[model samples]
Target chain A: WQECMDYAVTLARQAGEVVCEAIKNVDLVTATDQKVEKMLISSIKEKYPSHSFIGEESVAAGEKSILTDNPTWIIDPIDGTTNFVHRFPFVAVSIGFAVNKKIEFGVVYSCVEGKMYTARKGKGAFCNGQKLQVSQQEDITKSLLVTELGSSRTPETVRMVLSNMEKLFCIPVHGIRSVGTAAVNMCLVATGGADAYYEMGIHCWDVAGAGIIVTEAGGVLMDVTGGPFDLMSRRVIAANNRILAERIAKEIQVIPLQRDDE
Target chain B: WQECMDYAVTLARQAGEVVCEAIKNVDLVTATDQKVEKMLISSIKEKYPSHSFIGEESVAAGEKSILTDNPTWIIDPIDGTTNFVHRFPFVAVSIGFAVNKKIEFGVVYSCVEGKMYTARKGKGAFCNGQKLQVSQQEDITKSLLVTELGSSRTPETVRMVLSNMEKLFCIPVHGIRSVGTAAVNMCLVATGGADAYYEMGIHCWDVAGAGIIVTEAGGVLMDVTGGPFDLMSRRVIAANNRILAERIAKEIQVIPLQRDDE
Candidate 1:
C-alpha cells in the first residue's frame, strides 16, 4: 500500500503538470483531457496489466462505471473540468487504489494550488507533507459547509438544490463555499478548512481518492442515505464527524417524489 | 495615480502577510485583525494624512461606512474574514483609492494564493505580472458565474439569494461558485477565470478595490438595479462585458422590499 501510494502521488503530480501547462493560457482544448487520461491509464496499465481500472474519460465515453472487488485503480484525470474549462484553479488529478472493495490508498494533486493530499488506510492523511485533520467545530451554526451545484439544471433539480441551500441557511451555518471541484472539496474537509461537504450527481472517480483521505483525517464519508459509501451510488456526504454529517444530511437531503405527487 | 497604485500594492501585500501568519494555525485572533488594520491605517495615514480612510474593522466597530469624495483610501484589512476565520485561502487585503468619488486605483492581494491584482485608471489590470482580461464567452449558457451568501441569513435574505441562484441555474450557466470572498470573486471575473460575479449586501470595502480591476480588465461593474454602482448601495454585478452583465442582471437582480410590498 505504501509503494502504491507513492506511485499514485508521482503519477498525480505528473498529470497535474500536464493540466497546468494546458491551462496556462486559459484556453482549454479537449485534446488536453484525453491526452492526460490516456497517458495515466496507459502507464498504470503497463505496470499492472491484471489490475481493473476505471477512469472518467472511459466512463463518459459509454463504459460502465463499476467497482470490482479486486485490486482496482480509480482515476479522474482532470476533476473539475468545468473549472478547468474556465481556467479556474480548482482542478485536480485524483488516483485511488482499492483492494477487495475497500480503498487502501489515495493521492489527489490540485494542479494550480500546488497541494498534494495523500492517505493510506489505518495510517493517516497529509496535505503538502503536513498531517491533516478536520476542524473541531461541532456546532452546526458555526461550522463552514461546502456544497456544489452539479452540471444538470432542470427546474426541479435547481429547485431542490436551492431549497436545500435555503434550509442550510436557516440553520445559519458560518458560510458556504463551492470551489467547483469534488476532490478539492473533500480535501478541504479533511484539512479542517471546511466542516462538511455534500454533493449529488458525482461519480466514483470524483470521490474515491478523497474518500480515504477524509476518513484518515478523522472525518466521515458516507452515502447521503446513511449507508456505507458505494462508489457506484454517486452520492456523498463527508464531514468532520458523524453528527455533523447527519445534521447536514437532515437539512440538505432531497426527498424522493412527494407523497402528494405519487 | 501610478504612485498611489504602487503604494497600495505594497501595503496590501504587507497586510496580507500579517493575515497569512494569523491564519497559519487555522484559528482567527481578534488581535490579528486589529494589528493588521492599525498597521495599514497608520502607515497609509502617515504617508497621506489628508487622505481619509475607511476599513472593514473600523466600519464594523461603528466608525462609519460612508465614502468621502476625497483622495481616500478604502481598505478591507481582511476581506473574506469568514473565510479567513475558517482558514480558507480566498481571503485578501483589498486597497482602493478614490478621488472625487471615483475609484482610480486599486490593489488586492490574496496572500495564500500569492496573487496580487492591481489596476490604475486607464491602465489595464494585471494578476501577478500578466495582463488580465475577461473571458470571451459571449453565450451566457456557456459562462461561469460567481456569487456569495452574505452575512445576513434571515429567512427573507436566504430565500432571496437561493431564488436568485435558482434563476441563474435555470439559465444553465456553466457553473456557480462562491469562494466567500467578494474581492477574490471579482478578481476571478476580471482575470477571465469566471465570466460574471454578482452579490448583494456587500459593503464598499468588499468591492472598492476589485471594482477598478474588473473595469480595467474590459469587464463591466454596475449596480444590480441597472444603475451606476454605488459604493454604499452594497449591490454589485460584474461581468465580462455590458451585454453579459445586463443578461445576468436580468436574471438575478434582487428586488427591493418596499417596492415589492406595495
Candidate 2:
C-alpha cells in the first residue's frame, strides 16, 4: 500500500507537470485530456498489465464501468477540464488505487496551485507534507459549503442543484463556493479549507482519489442519500464532520435519476 | 499615472504577503482583514496623506462612500474575506487609484495564487508579466461564465441570483464558476480565464480595481440594467465582449432593491 501510494503520487506530479505545460501553451482541453489519459494509462499498464483501469475520457466514450476484487486503477487525467481550458488554476490530476473493490490509496495534484494531496487507507492524509484535518466548526450557519454546477444541463440536474442552493440560502451559511473541480473541492474540505462539499451527477473517478483523502483527514464521505459512498455511485457529500454532514444531508434534496425519455 | 500604477502594484504585492502570512497562521477573517487594511492605509497614507481613501472596513464601519475630485485611493484590503477565512486561496488585495471619480490605475494581487494583475487607463492589462486579452467566444452556449454570491444572504438576493442561474442552465454554457472573489472574478474575465462575470449588490471597493483591469483588457464593464457602470451603483457585468454582455443583460434578472421595512 505504501508503494502504491508513492507510485500514485509520483505519477500524479509528473502528469501534473505535463498538464501545466499543455495549459501554458493554451492547448485544447480535449487534446490535453487525451494526451494525459494516454500517458497515465500507458504508464500504469506497462507496469501492471493485469490490473483493471478506468479513465474519465474512456468512460465518457462508452467504456463500461467495472470493478473487480483484483487491484484496479481509477484515473481522472484532468478533473475540472473546463477550468483548465480557461486557465482558472483549479484543475487537478486524480489517481486512485483500489483492491478488493475498496480504495487503498490515492493522490491528487494541482500543478498550478502547487498542492499535492495523498492518502492511504488507515493512514492520515497530507497536503504538501503537512497533515490535514477537517474544520472543527459544527454550527451550520457559521460554516462554509462547497458545491458545483456540473457540466450536465439536464433540467432535473440543474433544478436539483439550484433548489438545494435555494434551500442553503435560507440556512444562510458563512458562504458558498463552486471551485469548478470535485477533487479540489474534496481536498479543500479534507484540509479544513472549507466546511462541506456536496455535489451530484459526478463520476467515480471525479472523487475516488479525493474521497480517501477526505476520510483520512478525519472527514466524512457519504452519498447524497446519506448512505455509505460506493465507487459506483457518482453522488457525494464530503464534510468536515458528521454534524455538518448530517445538517447538509437533511437540508439538501436530490432528485432521482432521469432518462432522456422522461 | 504610470508611477501611480507602479506604486499601487508594489503596495498591493507587499500587502498580499502580509495577508498570506496571516492566512497561513489560521487567523480570523476579521483579524486578517483589519490588519491588511491598516497596513495598506497606513503605508499609503504616510506616502501620500493628501490623497483621499476609501476602504471596505471603513465603509462597513459607517464611513460615507465619498469620491472627491482629487486623487483618491480605493482599497479592499482582502476581497473574498470568507474565502480567506476558509483558506480557499481565492482572496485578493484590490487597490485602485482614481482622479475625479475616474479610475486612473488599478492592481489586484492574489498571494495564494501568486498572481499580480495590473492596469492603467489607456494602457493594457496584464497578469503577472504577461499581457492579457479577453476571450472572443461570442456564442452564449459555448462561453464560460464566472459570477459571485454577495455577502447579503437576504431571501430576495438569494432567490434573484438562483433564478438567474436557472435561466443560465437553460442556455447550457461551457461551465459556470463562483470563485467568491470579485477582484479575482473580474481578473479572470480580463485574462480570458472566463468569458463573463455578473453580480449584484457588490460594493465599489470590491470591483474598483478589477473594473479597470477588465476594460483595459478589451472587455466591457457595465451595469446589468443596461446603464454605464457607476462605482457607487453596486451593479456590474464584466464580459469578454459586448455580445456576451448583451446576452447576459437580456436574460439575467436583477431583483429590485427592498428596503428594511419591506
Candidate 3:
C-alpha cells in the first residue's frame, strides 16, 4: 500500500540526507570493504532493531539469505561506495520492502544531490513525487544509455555485454556511462536518465530496492538468462522500458544460474 | 601586466559562456566535426585575430610552431566532446595565451557551470573571481586524485593506468577519473580538486590553456619526459604541488603521436 511505501521512501530519503551531511563533513571511505559496510549496518541496526537488515558490507543473521515469504528490509546503505570514496557525486542509499518473497516497494536516494526515486509494485514510480517513465524513442541507439559493471568474475558474460555495446554503438545514440554505483545506476535508469543498466556479480542488496522502483516506473528487470527476475537472481539487466529491456536481453547471453548466487 | 592577462581571461570567459549556452540546449553534439570546430574557432578568432589558433578538430597554422614570437591563442572549444555529447556536464572551453615563444596566460571555463579560471605570467590564478592556488595536500597516495585520459588508440595505456591504480589503491584520497576530457582534466589539477593530471597523446589545444591555469593556480606543469612544456608537447603531467607532480611524471609513459594531419 502507498502508506508503507511512502514511509519506506521517507526513511530512504532520510538515510540519504544523513549521508549527504556526512559527505560535507566526515571521513571519506578509505577502503571499500568490510569496515564501511559494517559501520552502516551497525548504525541502522541500532536505529531499528525489529526490522530485518541485509547489506553489502556485512550480512546480518539469517536475513542474509535470499527472499522468502516474510517481510524483509533489504538495503545497500552506500550503493556507490567508490564514487562516494572518490567524491565523484554519484552514490546513493537503497532500501526496499519485500513480503511473501516478492518485493512490494522500494526507494533509491542518490546522496550526492538528494534526488529521490520511489516505487511500489503494480502501481507506479516517482522521482521526488513527479511521475516517471522511459523514453519513447523507438531506435535503441537513440533511446539507450546503458551502464554496466566491470568485474573479472563473469568472463563470458562480460564479453556478451561488450558485444551488445558494439551492436548498440553502431546506432550511436547517447554514449554510455560507467559511473560506479549500483544503486545510483539503477535509480538513474528508473528516472530515464539512463535507458538501461546491465550488471553481473552484483548482490541482491544492490538491486532489490531499485528493481521495484524501475518496475513501478514502467521499466523491466530480467535475469541474464531471460527468466523471472527476483531477489535471488545474482545478475540482472534493467531497462527503463520493457520493450528495450527484452530486446537487449535477447542480444545478450542467457547463462543459466547454477545456484541462487549465479 | 595583469591587465593584459585579465583581457585574456575575459575573452576566455566569454568564449566559455558561449559554449555553456550551447551545451545546455543540446543533449547530443550532433554537429559535424568540421562544422562545430569551425564555429568555435570563428568565435575565438573574432576575439583575437592577431593571434594564431591551434584548435582541436581543426588545423594548426604558422611555423612559429609553438615557439613563435607572434602571440598565439591555443584553444579547445569543447574539451570533453564525448561527455558533452552525452550531456554528462564535465566539459570546458580552454584558452591558452602565449607570447614570444611561451605561454603567457591561461583560462579554463567549466562552460556548463560558468566557472571561469584565469592566470597570467607572474600573476596568480583565479576561478570565478576568487583567488585560486594549488592544493596543499601532502600525501600523494591519499592526496592525489589523478585524472587520466583513456585513448582508443592505446588499450595498453588504459592497462597501465589501471595497474597504477592498483598500487595507489592503498592511498586515502580519491582514485582516478578518465572522464574523456583533457582540458577539464587539467583544470581539475589546477583547482586542487585533483592533485595531478597525467596523460599522453593530448594536443596543444587540450592542455595549452589549462596548463597556464595550473601554473597560475600555483601548480607545476611539465612534459612527462621532464622537459619544458610548450604548445608543442603532447605529453603532460600537472600538479598543484611541485614534488608530487614531478613524482607522478616519472611513473608514467607517453604514447607516441602518429597523426600526420595538419
Candidate 4:
C-alpha cells in the first residue's frame, strides 16, 4: 500500500509534465487531457491489472463509475482545463487510490507550480516534503474561503452558485477566492493557506485525492448539508476544523448533480 | 531610464527574495514588510534622490501620497499581505516609476512563484523574458474574470462587493477567480491567463505597476464606470480588449473609495 502511495505520486508527476508542456498549445489541451488520463489508467493497470478506474475523461465517454468494495483508482488527469487553456497556473493532475469504497491514499500534482501533494490515511498530508496543516481559524467571519463557480452557466445553476457565494460573503467571511481547480483548492485548505473550501458540481475525481489530503492534514470534510462526507455525492465542504465547516455548510445552498457512483 | 527600469527589477527581486524566505515565519511578516519597503526606498534614494516616493507603508504611516510632474516611484512592498501571512503564494512586490505624471516603467515580482513581470511604456509587457499578451476572447460570457473581496468586511462594503459579484455571475462569465494579489492578478490578465480583471478599494500602489503592465500587454484599462482609467481613482478594470472591458464595466456597480492622489 505504501508503494502504491509512492506509485501514485510518481504517476501524478509524470502525467503533470506532459500537461504543462501541452499547455503551451491551446489546441493540444483536450488531446493532452484525454491522453494523460488513458496513460495514467493503463500504467496503473500495468502495475495492478485488477484495479478499476473512475476517470473524468472515461466517465465523460459513457463509463459508469462503480465504487465497490474493491481497489479502484480515481483520476482527474487535468483538473482546471480552462485554467490550463489560458495558463492560469492552477491546473492539476489528481490521482486517488481506494479500497473497500474508502480512499487509502491520495496524490495531486500542480503542474505549473510543481507542487506534489500526497497523503496516506494515517501518515498525514504534505506538499513536496513539507508537512501540511490546516489553519486554526475557527471564526467564519475571520476566515478566507475557496469555492468554484462551476462551468454550468444555465440560469438556475448560475443563480444558485452565485446566490450561495453572496450569502457566504454576506455571512461576512473576511474573503473568498476561486483557484478554479478543485483538488488544489482543497489542498489550499489542507496546507493552512486558506481556512475553508466548499463546492458542489464536482465529481469523485475532483475531490477523491483532495478529500483524504484535507482530513489527514487535520482538516474536516462534510456534505454541504452537514452530513457525513461522501466522495460520490457531488458536494463537499473541506475546512480547517468543524466549526468553520459547519458554518459554511449552514450558509450554502445546495446544487444537486447526480451522484458519481450512481 | 532603461537603467532605472533595470534597477526597479533588481530592487523587486531582492525584496521578493526576502518576502518568500520570510514567508516561513508568519509572526515576522509585518516586520519583513516594513523592512523591505524601507530598503527599496533607500536604495532608490542613494541612486536618485531627486525622485519622490509614494509607498504603501509610507502612506500607512501617515506620509501623504502626492503624485507630481517630478520623477516619482510608487511601491507596494508587499502586495497581498494576508496571502503572505498564510503562505497562499500570490504575494508580490510592485514598483512603478513615473515622471511628468505618466508611468514610465513598472515591475511586479511575485515572491513565491518567482514570476517577474515588467513593462516599460511603449516597450510591451513581459514575465521573465517572455512577452506578455492578453487573451483574444471577445465574448464576455466566454471570459474569465478576477476580482478581490478585498479586506473591508463592514456590512455595507461586503454587501456591495458581493452584489457586484452576483451580477457578474448572473452575466455569467466563463468563471471567476481571486488570486488574492492585485498586482499578480493584473499580471494574469497581461499574460492572457485571464480575460479580464476588475477591483475596487485599491490604492495607486496596488495598480501602479499593474496598470501599465496590462495596457502594455495589449489589454485595456478603464475606470469602473467605463470612463478613462485614472490610476488614483481606486476603481479600475483591466481587460483583454475594449469589448470585454466595457462589458464588465456595464455589469459592475460602483463602490466609491477615496482617490489615492487627493
Candidate 5:
C-alpha cells in the first residue's frame, strides 16, 4: 500500500509537469491523436509494469483489465483539455489507485493554481497539505453546479446535459459552469468552489482519480446506478456533499454499482 | 471645454472613491434604495450643480426628463451590483459627459482590478495612463464577448443574449463571459481582456462613461438600433472591434428599450 501510494504521488506530479510544459502558448493544438495522453500512461506503466492502466484517450485499449487484487493506477493526463487548449487556466492532472476493484487513493493537481489534493483510503483528503471538506450548503438554489460537455459529443448527449442543466437553472442555482473539463470539476467540488458535479459518458479514468479525492474530502461519489461507484463504472457519475450527493443521485436516477459487473 | 474636462476627471475620481467606499462590504446591502443611488448622483452634481444628472435609479425617478444645454453628468454608481452582492469582485464606477445629447467624454474605474479608462472627444482612450487599442483579431469566434444581465430582467433576455452567443459559439467568437458588469467589460475590451461587450437595458451610467473610452481606444460603440444611443436612448447596445460589433448588431434584431409611457 505504501509503495503504490508513493508512486501515485510521483506520477501525478510528473503528469502535472508535463501539462505545464505543453501549455506554452495561448493558441492550442487539439490534435485528436491523444498522443500525449497515451505517452503519459505508457511512462507510468514502465515504472509499474504489472499495474493495470486506464487513461482518458486509451480507456478501452489497455491489455490488463480493471478487475484485480493487485494495485491498479488510473489517470487523466490533461483533464480540462479544451480549457488548456484555450489557455483558460483551469486544467489539471488527476491520478489515483484501486485495489480489489475499489479506489484506494488519489491525487489531483490544478496546474494553474499550483494546488495538489491527495487522499488515501480511510485517510482524510488534503489540498496542499490543508485538510479538505465537502461543502455545507444544502439548498440547490444557492449552490453552483459544475458540469462538462464536449463540442464533438453526440448532439443528443449534449442536449440532455444542457436540458438537465436548464432545469437546475430554472431553480436558479447560484451558477452553472460547463468549464470544459471533468476532473477539475471534481476538484472544484472537493474544494467547495462548486457544490456538486454531474456528468455522463465520462470514462473511469477521467473520474477515478478525482472521485477518491472527493470522498476523502467528506463528499460522496455514486454512479447513476447508486452502489459503490468503482474505477470502471461507465454510466452516470456524481459527487457532492454527502447529504446532497445521495439526494442528487436519486433525482438523476443513478443506480448502485454491484460487484457482479466486474 | 477644458475647464469642464478637468472637472469631469476630478468628479469621476471622487465619484469612484465614493463608489469604492460604498462597495467596501458590498454584499451586506440587500436592495439599494433609490436613495442610495441618488446620494452618489447628488454628490457628483455638486461639482457641476448646473449640469443635468442621468443615473440608473435616478432615471427611474424622472432624472431622464431633465433637458438642459448645460453639460450633463451621466453616472452609474454601481455597475454589476449583483456580482458585488455575490462578492465576485468585478464592479465599477462609471462617469460620463454629454453635450447637446452627444456623449463628449467619459471614464470608467474598475475597482477590483484598479484600472481606470478615460477619453475625451478627439483624445484617444487610455488605461492606467497607457494608450489602449482593440484586439487585432477580427473574427467573432476568436474574440472574447463580455456581457451582463440584470437580475430583475427576464431569463428570456439572457436567452436572447445566449442565442446571439450561440451563433458566435458555433462559429465561436473567442470567449463569452457574462462577467456581470458593463463598465468593467468596456475597460477589459480596451485592455484586450475582452474583445467586445453588448447588453440590453443597461443605463447611461453603465456604458456612458465607458462609451467614449472604447471609441477613443479605437473601438466602436453604437446602439443596436444603428442610431445615436446615448444617456436616454431606450435600446440595445454593442461595443467592440468595429467590424465584429457591426456584425453582432446586424445578426441580432436587438429589442429596443421601452420607457413606461405613463
Candidate 6:
C-alpha cells in the first residue's frame, strides 16, 4: 500500500500537468475530460492489472459504477468540469485508492492554484508539502461554508437546494461559498480555510479523493442527515468537527439519493 | 493618465506581494490592512501628490469620501478582508483611478493566485498581461453566475440577498457561485469565468476598482433596476450582454442604498 500511495501521488501530479496544458486551446468540454480519464485509467491499469475503476466519465457513459471489496481506484479526472470548460480556475484532478471497501489513500491536485493535497490511511494530510489542519471554529453560525447548487434542475431538486440554502443563509452564518467543485470544497476544509462543506447529488468520485485528506487533517465527514458517512451515498457534510458538522446537518432538508455502491 | 495607470500597475503588484506575506501572520491583521492602504496612497501621492483619494480604511475611520470632479484614486487595499483573515485564498488588492468622475484605469490583483486584472479606458483589459473577455453565453438558463453575500447582516439585507439569489437560481441558471469577494467576483466576469455578477450593498471602492476592467473586457454593467450604472449607488448587475443582464435584473428584488457621492 505504501508503494500504491507513492504511485498515486506521482500519477496525479503527472495528470495535472497534462490537464493544465490541455486547457490552453480555449475550447474544452467533456472531450478533454474524457481524454484525461482515459489517460489516467490507462496509466493506472498498466501499473496495477488487478484493480477496478469507477470514474465520472465512464459512469456517465453507461458504465455501471459499484464500489466493491477489491483494489479499486475511484477518480474524477476533471472534478469541476463546468469550471474547466469556462476556465474558472478552481478545477482539480482527484484520485482515491480503496481496498476492501475502505479508502487507503487520496490525492487531489487543485491544479489551477498549483495546490497538491494528499493523505494516507494512518498518516496525516499535506497540501503542497505543508501539513494541513482543519479550522478550530466551533460555532456553526460563525463558520464559513463551501457547497454547490448541483446540476440537477428539476423543480423538486431545485426547490430543496434553494430551501436548504435559505435556511443556512438566514442563520447569518459568517459566510457561504459554492465553488462548483466537491473535491476542492472538501480540500478547503482540510486546509482550515473553510469550516464546513455540505452538498447533495455529488458522486462518489467527487469526494472519495478528498474525504481521506479531510479526516487525516482532523476533520469529520458525515452523511448530510447527521448520520455516519457513506461515500457511495452521494450526500456529505465535511466539517472541522462534529459539533458544528451535526449543527449544519440539522439545517438542511435531506433528500434521499441513489447510492453508488448499489 | 498614462503615467497614472502605469504607476498603479506597479503599486498594485507590489502591495499584492506584501499582502501575501502578511497573510501568514494572523496577529498582524491589525496593520497589514492599514499598512497596505497607506503604502498605496503615499506611493501615489509621492509622485502625483495633488490627487485626493477614497479608500476603505480611511472611510471606515470616518475620514469620509467625496467622489469629486478631479483626479481621484478609489482604493481597497485588501478587497476581501474577511477572506484574508480566514485564509480563503480569493483575496485581492483593487485600485482605480478616476478623472473628472469617470474611471480612467483599473487594476485588481487577486493576490493569492497571482492574477493581475488590469484595464485602461479604450485600451482593453488584461490578466497578468493576457487579454481578457467575457463569456458569450446568451441564454439565461445556460449561464454560470458569481455573486457575494456582503458584510451587512441586517435581516432585511439577508432576506434580500437570499431572495434575489433564489429567484435567479429557479430561472435554472447553469450554476451559482459565491466566492465572497466583490473585486474577484467582478474579475471573474472580466475573465469570462462566470457569465454575470450582481450584488447589493457594495461600496464605491469595492466595485469601482474592478468596474472598468469588466467593461473593458467586453461586458455590460447596469444598476439592479435595469438602469444606467452609478458607481456610488451600491447596486449593480454586470454581464456579457444586455439580454442576460436584464433578465437577471428582472429577477432580483432591488434594494436602494445611500449613495457614495452624497
Docking class of 6: medium
Residue pairs with backbone atoms closer than 3 Å in model 3 (clashes): B142-B173
Interface RMSD of 2: 1.3
Off by over 4 Å in 4: A57-64, B57-64
Docking quality of model 5: it rates as incorrect
Report interface Cα RMSD per prediction: 0.9, 1.3, 6.2, 2.0, 4.4, 1.7
Tell me what fraction of the real C-alpha contacts between chains A and B each candidate also makes: 0.90, 0.88, 0.02, 0.69, 0.00, 0.64
Report iRMS (Å) of candidate 5.
4.4
Span of 10 residues, lowest total lDDT, candidate 3 chain B: B165-174
The full ranking of all candidates by DockQ, starting with the best, is 1, 2, 6, 4, 5, 3
Q: Judge the docking of candidate 4 as incorrect, acceptable, medium or high.
A: medium
| B1-262 per-residue lDDT for model 5 (tens digits) | 6677666566556655655565653234433424345655666566667777666555555644444667877767667665554444456767788888777888777765566788888978888789877666677666656654334325666556445545555554544555557787677677654667777666556677887887788777776756555445544454556677777677765654564221
TM-score for all models, in order of appearance: 0.93, 0.93, 0.73, 0.93, 0.69, 0.94
* Candidate 2 vs candidate 4, TM-score winner: 4
lDDT of 3 by residue, A94-182 (tens): 77778877888888887776678888887788888898775454456555354543433244654554545555544444455556677
lDDT of 5 by residue, A1-262 (tens): 8777777677677767667766653234444225456666777678778877655444354343345677777767777654565455567787878888788988888876577888898988888888878767787667766665334334444445445555556566666554456777787688665678877656776787788888888787766546666545555445555555655565653223332224
Q: Cα deviation of A27 in candidate 4 (Å)?
A: 5.1
TM-score (chain B) for candidate 3 is: 0.81
Candidate 6 scores a C-alpha RMSD against the true structure in Å of 2.4
* Model 6's DockQ score: 0.63
Better of 2 and 4 by DockQ: 2
- Candidate topping lDDT: 4
Q: How much does each candidate deviate from the true structure in C-alpha RMSD? A: 3.8, 3.1, 5.6, 2.3, 6.1, 2.4
DockQ pick, better of 1 and 5: 1
Evaluate residue A4 in candidate 3 and report its C-alpha lDDT on the 0 to 100 scale: 59
Tell me the tens digit of each residue's lDDT in model 4 across B1-262: 9999998888999999889888875357779987898899899999999989887766777877778898899988999987876678789999999999999999999988878999999989989999998889998777888888877757787778877877887776778899898999999999999999999998899899988999999999998898999887888899999999899888878887887766
